[PDB]
Design a protein around this nucleic acid. Structure first.
Ligand SMILES: Nc1nc2c(ncn2[C@@H]2O[C@H](COP(=O)(O)CP(=O)(O)OP(=O)(O)O)[C@@H](O)[C@H]2OP(=O)(O)OC[C@H]2O[C@@H](n3cnc4c(N)ncnc43)[C@H](O)[C@@H]2O)c(=O)[nH]1
Ligand SMILES: Nc1nc2c(ncn2[C@@H]2O[C@H](COP(=O)(O)CP(=O)(O)OP(=O)(O)O)[C@@H](O)[C@H]2OP(=O)(O)OC[C@H]2O[C@@H](n3cnc4c(N)ncnc43)[C@H](O)[C@@H]2O)c(=O)[nH]1
Ligand SMILES: [Mg+2]
Ligand SMILES: [Mg+2]
Ligand SMILES: [Mg+2]
Ligand SMILES: [Zn+2]
Ligand SMILES: [Zn+2]
Lengths: 340, 352
DNA sequence: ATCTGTACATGTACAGAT
DNA sequence: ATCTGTACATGTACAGAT
DNA sequence: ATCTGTACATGTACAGAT
DNA sequence: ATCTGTACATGTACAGAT
C-alpha cells in the first residue's frame, strides 16, 4: 500500500547516527566561534528546527536546519507594505538594521571557521539570494546539507499580523495557543529589500509537530498512534519526486505542503480522523485539500493569515495548473511516481 | 437535580472579590516581612494551592491555602522507616534550626509562627488573629473577620529541585490519561516538604517532614482532560470538577454533624477522584449529561476503598491513607453506612 | 553614571454575572 | 450568548543602591 | 557563564506472538 | 501480514558543579 512507500522513506538508525555525529561536530564548532571571538554574535544560541528534528525527514538524513538566534532588546518593527510577513527592524552598531549587512558578516565568520576544519569534508555553498541561510555541504560519507539560519529573537508580544494566526483553539486549545504566543518570535534575514527581515515560527512548528494531537497521548507509549506525520511524509515525497522530474515546479517547496497539512489538522482536529487504519482516506483527503488550494490559488500562511503563499505574485497560474494535472494524474493511477 | 446542589455550592463574584482583596493584603504583607534581612526566611516564595486556586472551593470563599516555600540547595533525605511520605532532612540562614546535620521541622515552624504572630499584631486595618496551633498541621492559620469568617493556612515548605524521592517512582500514574510528556514535565518541577508536626510522642517527632505535591495537584485540577480542550471555550465541558465538589460537600456536611468522622478530610476524596480520573481517562466518561452516573460511580469507588481499608496516596503508592494505623475500621464502617444511606435516599443531607 | 530587585503593564483562561 | 473580576505568567520601568 | 549528568521522549531494528 | 516487547540511538530540558 502506501505502507510500503513509508517503509522506503523511513530513515535508518545507522545513517541517522553517522550523519548526526558529523553534523554536530561542525555545528558545535561554528557555535563556539560565534561566542569566543570579540564577535558581534556573542550570545547567539542554537535551536534545531525542520524535518529531521520534527521526525518527518524522509529518504535519508541529509538535510539539517539549525537556527543561530540572538536576543535583541526592545526592537521596533515596521511592516514592509501590507505583506504581513516582512518588516524593517529598528554590539550590532555597524549593521535601520540591515539584514544583508548582518548576514554578510555572519557568513564571513562561518566561511573563515569552515576553512579551519581539517577532519570533515565541508564547504560553504555559493549564496542564493532569497535564502536567509548559510548552507554547508558536507561529504564525509556522502551528501549532507546544513542550513545555518541567522535569527533575531524578540520577547515582545507577536506582531499584529499574527493576531488571527495559529488557529489551534479547537484542536490544541486556548492554553496551548496562549503559551505558544508567550514564547518569543523570530526574524530571519530573507531577501530577494536588503533591510527586510521575515517572521519565522520554526520553533512553534516544531512544538506542533511533536504535540500534534487533540489527546495528550496521541503517539505516546500509553496512547494510540495516528498517521498525521505519515501523511506529511507522503505528501512531501510526492512533491520531491515531481519536483525532481519537472522544472515547471521550481516555485513549489515543502513549506507549501507543511502549511497545507497544518490547515487540514485544524479542519480535522480529532485523532480518530487520522487513524493509521485510514492512511489512504487521510492521504487522499489531503491531496484533495491541496488541489483546492491550487484551484482557488489560496494557501494562507498558518501564522500570518493575510499572506497568501499561492498569490499570483509568488507562483504563476500556469505553474499551479501544471502541478494540479500532475497530482490529479498520480492520484488517479495508483501513484506511479512512488515507484521510481 | 444534582445541578441544583451545584447552584447552591457555586461561589459568588461579590463574595470572591471581598474575600480575595482582604486575603491578598494580609498575605502580601506577611510575605514582605519574611523578606527583611536577618530573617531566616529571606528568599521564601509564595505559591497558592488548594481548592480556591483549583476552582473547587464550595459554598463560600472562606478557606485559602498558601505555601511559603524556601529553596534549600544541598539536601539529603532519609526516609522515616519505609513510610514513603515522611523524611528527615540533612546537610546558613537556617543555622539555628540545625541539630547536628538535621533540620528540625518544629524549630523552623516555631520561628516562622513567631514572626507571623508579630506581623499580624501590626495590622490594624483588618480584623485578623492567629489560630491556636493544631497538632498535625504544617500551617500557621489566620482567622480573618471580613465581617465574615475566613481562614488562611500559611504553609511552610522546603523546596528541592532534585529528582523526586524513589517512593514516588510508581506514583502519578497519568500515562493513559494526561500522558508521558505531561508526567515527565511534572516530575521535572520541584518537590515540597512540609513539617509533619505530630504530637504523638514517637521518635524523630520534631524533625520529620512530609512530601507535598499541592503544586502538581493544582496543575492536574486545571489541566484535567485527555483532550487539551476539555472545559475550554472551543472544547466540551466535563463534570470532573463538579463530581469533586459534590463528593467534598457530602463529606463536609457529614463531618459537621458527626464527630465519628473526625479522622476523615477532603484530601481523602481528592485522592479517590484522582484514582477514578485515571481509571476512566476519557472525557466522554465525564459527560455533564451523566453527572449522576459519574457521581454515583465515585461514591461506589470510595465505598470500596472504605470496605477494603485501602486508599493509596496518588503520588506515593505504598502510603495507605486508610491504613488501620491512621483510621479505625469502626470509623470506616460508620462513614460507609452514612454514604450508603445518603446514596439510597435522595441525599437528604444536600438539603440541610 | 550604571545596575537592579520590585512592582507595574499586558494579556488571557476560567468561571460567574448579565 | 456576551461581559467581567480574579489569578497567573511574562515583559519592562525605575527609585534607590552601587 | 559554560559544561556535564540524568532522565525520558521520539525514533528504528528485529524476534516472537497474534 | 500486523502487533508487541526489547534493545539500541538520538535529541532535549534542566539541575548542580565548575
Ligand atoms: N524553513 C522554512 N522554509 C521555508 C519557509 N518559507 C518557504 N520555505 C521554503 O520551503 C523549503 C523548506 O525548507 P526546510 O528544509 O527548512 C523545511 P523542513 O521542515 O526541514 O523540510 P524538508 O527539509 O524535508 O524539506 C525551503 O525550500 C524554503 O526555501 P527558503 O525559505 O529559501 O529556505 C532556505 C533555508 O533557510 C532556512 N529557512 C528558510 N526560511 C526560514 C524561516 N522562515 N525560518 C527559519 N529558517 C528558514 C531553512 O533552513 C531553509 O532550508 C519558512 O518559513 N521556513
Ligand atoms: N492539602 C492537603 N491536605 C491534607 C493532606 N493530608 C491531609 N490533609 C488534610 O486534609 C484537609 C485538606 O486541606 P486543604 O485545604 O489544603 C485541601 P483543599 O483542596 O484546599 O480543600 P478544602 O480547602 O475545600 O477543604 C486539611 O484538613 C488537611 O489537614 P492537615 O494535612 O493536617 O493540614 C492542615 C492545613 O495545612 C495545609 N496542608 C495540609 N496538607 C498539606 C500538604 N500536603 N501540602 C501543603 N499544605 C498542606 C492546608 O492548608 C490544610 O488545610 C495533604 O497531603 N494535602
Ligand atoms: Mg529541512
Ligand atoms: Mg533545509
Ligand atoms: Mg486548608
Ligand atoms: Zn499522533
Ligand atoms: Zn473538563
Amino acid at each position: 500500500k502506501l505502507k510500503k512507500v513509508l517503509d522506503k522513506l523511513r530513515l535508518k538508525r545507522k545513517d541517522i547516527s553517522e550523519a548526526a555525529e558529523t553534523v554536530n561536530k561542525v555545528v558545535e564548532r561554528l557555535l563556539r566561534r560565534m561566542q569566543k571571538r570579540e564577535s558581534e554574535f556573542k550570545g547567539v544560541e542554537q535551536l534545531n528546527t525542520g524535518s529531521y528534528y520534527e521526525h518527518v525527514k524522509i529518504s535519508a538524513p541529509n538535510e539539517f536546519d539549525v537556527m543561530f538566534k540572538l536576543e535583541v532588546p526592545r526592537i521596533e518593527l515596521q511592516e514592509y507594505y501590507e505583506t504581513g510577513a516582512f518588516y524593517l527592524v529598528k554590539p550590532l552598531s555597524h549593521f535601520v538594521l540591515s539584514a544583508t549587512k548582518m548576514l554578510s558578516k555572519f557568513r564571513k565568520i562561518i566561511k573563515e571557521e569552515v576553512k579551519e576544519i581539517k577532519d570533515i569534508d565541508v564547504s560553504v555553498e555559493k549564496e542564493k539570494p532569497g535564502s536567509p541561510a548559510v548552507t554547508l555541504l558536507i561529504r564525509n560519507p556522502e551528501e549532507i546539507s546544513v542550513d545555518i539560519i541567522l535569527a533575531l529573537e524578540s520577547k515582545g508580544s507577536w506582531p499584529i499580523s499574527t493576531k488571527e494566526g495559529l488557529p489551534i483553539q479547537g484542536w490544541l486549545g486556548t492554553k496551548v495557543r496562549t503559551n505558544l504566543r508567550r514564547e518569543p518570535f523570530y526574524l530571519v534575514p530573507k531577501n530577494a529589500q536588503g533591510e527586510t527581515w521575515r517572521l519565522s515560527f520554526s520553533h512553534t512548528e516544531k512544538y506542533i509537530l511533536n504535540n500534534h494531537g487533540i489527546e495528550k497521548t496521541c503517539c505516546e507509549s500509553s496512547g494510540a498512534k495516528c498517521c498525521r506525520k505519515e501523511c506529511l511524509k507522503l505528501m512531501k515525497y510526492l512533491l520531491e519526486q515531481l519536483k525532481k522530474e519537472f522544472q515547471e515546479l521550481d516555485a513549489f517547496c515543502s513549506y507549501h505542503v507543511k502549511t497545507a497539512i497544518f490547515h487540514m489538522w485544524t479542519q480535522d482536529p480529532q485523532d480518530s480522523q487520522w487513524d493509521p487504519r485510514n492512511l489512504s482516506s487521510c492521504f487522499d483527503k489531503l491531496l484533495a485539500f491541496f488541489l483546492e488550494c491550487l484551484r482557488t490559488e489560496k494557501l494562507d500562511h498558518y501564522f500570518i493569515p493575510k499572506f497568501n503563499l499561492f498569490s499570483q505574485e509568488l507562483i504563476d497560474r500556469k505553474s499551479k495548473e501544471f502541478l494540479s494535472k500532475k497530482i490529479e494524474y498520480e492520484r488517479n493511477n495508483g501513484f506511479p511516481i512512488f515507484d521510481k
